[PDB]
Structures are given as structure tokens and as C-alpha cells.
């Protein structure tokens, strides 16, 4: 198997392999040969291995002379064979073939997400971007894989189209995706040049900082402390910002979200998007309950009568609603005696 570059190599990358042998009955040393799908280089000069045991030998190809650089993109079949003698008519004993995918360098692909994807609910914030360093490209297809765990399968192929105007960015939308489990994921976007087969043109995986985190919206603890319950239109209602709390009770690595507060009155606008007590866009959502802000309590006198839903909401980057807590206040000027 290749070790080389951990990601698939390009035409400007050198590939270094690792290959071991092991026999459960024989012990005599054999001579190994490694051939690349280059088409121009020849089979490596036959070289012996060590004594063969049930334990696989060390990396026979670990030396610095076993390297290759491919001049064309596509699938290259790297094969390894075992003979006994170093002369040409020596009997072949075993063979093993592995594919190496070399990707295009002139095409740059990125996958951009808008908001935090929740649990089994659908997510439609993904979209892909293609930019070609050269002129007009042929048709392209894109697939998305949600996670690398076993049983998680690559999606179908979505037609992108062409990218004719050199290095301009071309955007395409990705159908709604559903995540079965919460936590960190490694979503991968692959781009090929054929609907059924063809070449793997590029792959993109978001960096460790931008990794997708599926959030569970029932684990969000919200503690809203609005002031007095049922009141009159002359009674001031207070919202204490140092006692209201927000927390994520599942993990301490969830992405940060903003908060908003609505008085449920048309005379006053809802507060602008704001972060928790001290966190910023580079922080995570705290597991321990934290005050929403350190400002003073905010007071408001209602302008009508009825039942009002003073609410506190958690929004994400795409202005979705992740969690929400409602406290109901009943305003009524019922008992007023005048003599």
C-alpha cells in the first residue's frame, strides 16, 4: 500500500510505498520486484528479502530509491511480484496489485457549509465550489460522503456542469443530507469527470478547524429568567441577563451559536445576534452553564393586553433556530378600582 502522501498524490507529488511479505510454512528468503504503472520505468532490480516467518517482514521498499512521480492523472496500478532466483526465467511465486489515484492539480475544489447540521433533521447548507486554473473543462460530477465510519456510503453523482471561464468560481448546490449520529464527522467531497466511471479529479476534506460537527438540539439547556409573571400594562417586566444560562450538555467541542431575545411586542425589536458571556467566534459552546451576558437587567413595559411569549432563541451561522425557551406572561388590567 502507498504511504507516500497521506492524501492522493498529484502529478507533482512523489509516491513512496510500503510492502511486506510473510509465509506460514516456508522460511527461505525470496527476491521481490516492484513495478509502477508509469509506463516508462522498468521493473526494479530483483532484491532479496529476509527470512520469512508468520510475522510480516519489515518494509522492504523503505529505501529512498523506491520512488515515482506520475506525469498523467488517473488510476495507476502498482504491482509487486515474488521470485526465487535473480535470473530471468526464475519461477514467479506471488503477485499483488494496488491502485494509486493521482488527481488533477489545475482544478481546485472546496466544500462550504452555512450553518450547523443538526441530528436526523435534514441539512441544506452545503454547497460546492470549483475553480479551474486552465481554460474550458469538460463535464464534471460531484459526490459527497458524510463520514468515513463503516456503513457510511458515498452519495450519488451530481452534475456540476462546465467551468469555461478560467479561474472563476463555479458554485453548485448539494441535496439535503441527514446525519444519524451527533459528534464530529469527516465529510469528504469528491469530483470525477464521468457519470458512472472515469477519473477521480479531486477530493476535498475540511481542515481540522472547519470539521463538520453534528449537534443534538435536545441537549441544549436553556434557562430563561424573565421577571414577574402575569402583570398589568403599568407593571414593569424585567429580564435578568446574569441569571439566564445556555449550555450544551453533550460535549465541549460543539460550534458556537448566537442568542436572541424577543419580548413578543411590536413596539420593541428583538435584540441583535450576540455571543454568550465572553466567548467569540473562535470559541466553542460551553458545557457548563454560562450567563448569556454581563450587562444590566433589561426592563420593558408592555403596550397591550393578552398572553405574550417572551422567548430566547439560539441561532447559527445560517440563521436557523437550534434551541428555544419560552416564558409566558399574561398582561391584563382586570382589577382596578376607582372611587
Amino acid at each position: 500500500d502507498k504511504l507516500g502522501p497521506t492524501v492522493n498524490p498529484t502529478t507533482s507529488d512523489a509516491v513512496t510505498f510500503t510492502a511486506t511479505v510473510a509465509s506460514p510454512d516456508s522460511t527461505t528468503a525470496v527476491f521481490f520486484t516492484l513495478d509502477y504503472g508509469d509506463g516508462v520505468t522498468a521493473e526494479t532490480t530483483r532484491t532479496t528479502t529476509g527470512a520469512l516467518s508468520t510475522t510480516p517482514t519489515a518494509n522492504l521498499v523503505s529505501a529512498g530509491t523506491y520512488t515515482v512521480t506520475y506525469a498523467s492523472i488517473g488510476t495507476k496500478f502498482v504491482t509487486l511480484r515474488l521470485y526465487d532466483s535473480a535470473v530471468a526465467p526464475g519461477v514467479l511465486l506471488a503477485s499483488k496489485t494496488v491502485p494509486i489515484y493521482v488527481e488533477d492539480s489545475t482544478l481546485t475544489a472546496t466544500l462550504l457549509q452555512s450553518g450547523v447540521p443538526r441530528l436526523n433533521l435534514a441539512f441544506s447548507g452545503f454547497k460546492g465550489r470549483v475553480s479551474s486554473s486552465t481554460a474550458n473543462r469538460a463535464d464534471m460530477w460531484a459526490t459527497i460522503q458524510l463520514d468515513t465510519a463503516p456503513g457510511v456510503f458515498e452519495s450519488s453523482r451530481i452534475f456540476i456542469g462546465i467551468a469555461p471561464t478560467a479561474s472563476t468560481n463555479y458554485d453548485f448546490v448539494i441535496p439535503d443530507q441527514v446525519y444519524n449520529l451527533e459528534g464530529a464527522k469527516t465529510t469528504v467531497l469528491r469530483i470525477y469527470d464521468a457519470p458512472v466511471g472515469g477519473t477521480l479529479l479531486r477530493t476535498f476534506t475540511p481542515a481540522a478547524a472547519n470539521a463538520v460537527y453534528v449537534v443534538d438540539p435536545s441537549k441544549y439547556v436553556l434557562t430563561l429568567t424573565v421577571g414577574p409573571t402575569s402583570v398589568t400594562t403599568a407593571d414593569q417586566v424585567t429580564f435578568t441577563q446574569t441569571t439566564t444560562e445556555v449550555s450544551y450538555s453533550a460535549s465541549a467541542t460543539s460550534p458556537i451559536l448566537q442568542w436572541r431575545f424577543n419580548w413578543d411586542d411590536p413596539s420593541v425589536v428583538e435584540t441583535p445576534l450576540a455571543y454568550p458571556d465572553a466567548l467569540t467566534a473562535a470559541s466553542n459552546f460551553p458545557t457548563t452553564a454560562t450567563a448569556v451576558s454581563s450587562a444590566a437587567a433589561s426592563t420593558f413595559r408592555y403596550t397591550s393586553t393578552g398572553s405574550k411569549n417572551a422567548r430566547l432563541r439560539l441561532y447559527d451561522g445560517a440563521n436557523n433556530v437550534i434551541a428555544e425557551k419560552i416564558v409566558v406572561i399574561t398582561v391584563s388590567n382586570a382589577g382596578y378600582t376607582l372611587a
Partner: protein, 291 residues
């Protein structure tokens, strides 16, 4: 070709039994083959009607096959349906296999009043994850409270219409007379003094003070008119046991409004009292909208 109860496929064979008849909820894999051939019998929950089949078709919604390879699957009898699992499991919330969360298929939920004198939109919340009617690998399960099936092989349980209700069973049924029994095929009307306006309810609702329900199976409560009033102080709504999802305490409201007595009158419609009118006026009849 294989006989019409068996299949033969290159990539898989054998069968997996139902996990809802075991203890830990793990399908038990066996390999039963027809004697005269090598083809494996179809798994429970599937059937093979014709001869040369590579896969066993799962049974449709409303039918069931609970034994290994069968030529066709039978229809669920009235009073039972083909929802995945059993009723005591479709309703349960307490797990016994920790690594599996097995005997808790939170597939039944309902809104209602709970013991924090608080109304509760669905008592069992969360994303439903056991919603399956096609592959039924065991005996049909009894209907959940509020639903009924009157004919053989209905795909889904149907909900009781607003004026009616369906209790859990006869013993735990709320207001329901002496001879009537509940088996899952008949929605019963709401008694006088009780009403119901929602679909698929296990209990009726008590008419509040200021209103009455004179007829049977009313979708709405009638409002008392000026000159009359209803004041039933013991009328109350059923409270849902959040552990067993069964409501207990229902006391019916009023059947007819009480007219105001002589010397008293009432002018507003929805009220619980009569007001004696002041000096210079009199009321010599019972039930006067204004003396």
C-alpha cells in the same frame, strides 16, 4: 428453479429472525434449507410466492409472516395492526439491554395534561426511529390507544374521529358504561357532559364551568346562554401518567344549564353564577336574561 418458499443468492443466505421475540433484541441467525434442494427458506417477515427468486420480498403494510419461508403472508385481524414491535414495546421507555436500548421503541406519543398541572405537547418527545409497517416478523400487535382497525389487513391504524375515543382497555377505561367492552375495533362516543375535539384520543374532555354537553359525541361544548349558568366544581380533565402513558382522572361536566332562580338574573353567556338585581327591579320567573 428454487421452490416457491425459498431463495438462493450469491452474496447472502440464511435468515435473521425477529428481534422483538427475543430478550436482548438481537436477531438470531439460522440456516434452514429446503430438503430436496439447497435453497434457503425465506426469513420471518418476508415471503416468496414464485419459483425463481434471488431475494425474498418483504410483506406489505398490514400483513405479516412470522415463520421461515412462506409462500404468502396473511392479513392482520381487526383489532391488531402490523407496526414494528409489540404494543408493550411500542409504548415503553425503560431499557433493559443497556448496549441496545432494546425494549424502548418510543413509537407512541400523545399530548395532554401532566402532573405538574401542566399541558404537555408530546409527552414522549424526540426523533421517532421505529416507524415500520412492512416487514412484520411476528404476531400482529394490538392497537395503540386512540386508534382502531375494523377490517382485515389495514396498512395503518386509523385514528378515532373527534367526537369519539378509544381507551387502553376496559379496566383502565375512563367514563364507559357497564356492558361496553373495548377490543380495538370500535371508537366509542363521549358521554353527556364530556366532549372531544381532537383526533385519536384515549379519553374525552370534561366540559368546563359555564358550558354543557347535552348530546352524545359532541365535538364541541355548548355555551350557556343568558339567564342560565353551569357550575360543576368537581369536573376535571384526565391526567396522563408519564410513566405508563395512561390517563386516569376524568369527571364529567354538566348536561343541562341551570336557570337563574326567582329574584336573580344573568346577562352574560358563559358564567357560573346568578346576580340578584338591585333596587327598583324584580325577577318573578326562573331564567331571566334581564330582570
Amino acid at each position: 428453479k428454487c421452490p416457491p418458499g425459498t431463495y438462493r443468492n450469491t452474496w447472502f443466505s440464511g435468515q435473521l429472525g425477529s428481534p422483538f421475540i427475543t430478550a436482548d433484541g438481537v436477531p438470531v441467525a439460522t440456516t434452514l434449507t429446503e430438503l430436496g434442494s439447497g435453497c434457503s427458506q425465506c426469513p420471518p417477515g418476508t415471503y416468496a410466492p414464485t419459483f425463481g427468486m434471488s431475494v425474498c420480498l418483504p410483506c406489505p403494510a398490514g400483513t405479516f409472516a412470522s415463520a421461515p419461508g412462506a409462500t404468502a403472508c396473511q392479513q392482520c385481524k381487526p383489532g391488531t395492526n402490523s407496526l414494528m414491535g409489540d404494543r408493550t414495546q411500542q409504548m415503553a421507555l425503560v431499557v433493559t439491554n443497556a448496549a441496545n436500548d432494546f425494549p424502548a421503541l418510543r413509537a407512541y406519543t400523545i399530548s395532554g395534561m401532566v402532573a405538574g398541572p401542566a399541558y404537555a405537547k408530546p409527552i414522549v418527545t424526540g426523533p421517532d426511529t421505529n416507524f415500520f409497517m412492512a416487514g412484520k416478523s411476528e404476531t400482529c400487535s394490538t392497537n395503540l390507544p386512540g386508534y382502531y382497525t375494523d377490517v382485515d389487513g389495514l396498512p395503518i391504524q386509523l385514528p378515532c374521529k373527534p367526537g369519539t375515543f378509544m381507551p387502553f382497555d376496559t379496566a383502565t377505561a375512563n367514563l364507559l358504561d357497564t356492558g361496553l367492552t373495548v377490543d380495538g375495533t370500535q371508537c366509542y362516543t363521549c358521554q353527556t357532559g364530556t366532549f372531544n375535539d381532537e383526533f385519536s384520543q384515549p379519553v374525552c374532555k370534561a366540559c368546563w364551568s359555564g358550558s354543557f354537553a347535552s348530546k352524545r359525541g359532541l365535538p364541541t361544548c355548548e355555551i350557556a346562554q343568558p339567564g342560565t349558568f353551569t357550575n360543576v366544581a368537581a369536573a376535571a380533565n384526565a391526567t396522563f401518567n408519564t410513566a405508563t402513558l395512561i390517563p386516569t382522572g376524568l369527571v364529567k361536566g354538566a348536561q343541562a344549564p341551570t336557570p337563574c332562580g326567582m329574584g336573580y338574573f344573568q346577562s352574560s353567556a358563559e358564567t357560573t353564577t346568578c346576580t340578584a338585581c338591585a333596587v327598583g327591579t324584580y325577577a318573578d320567573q326562573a331564567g331571566l336574561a334581564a330582570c
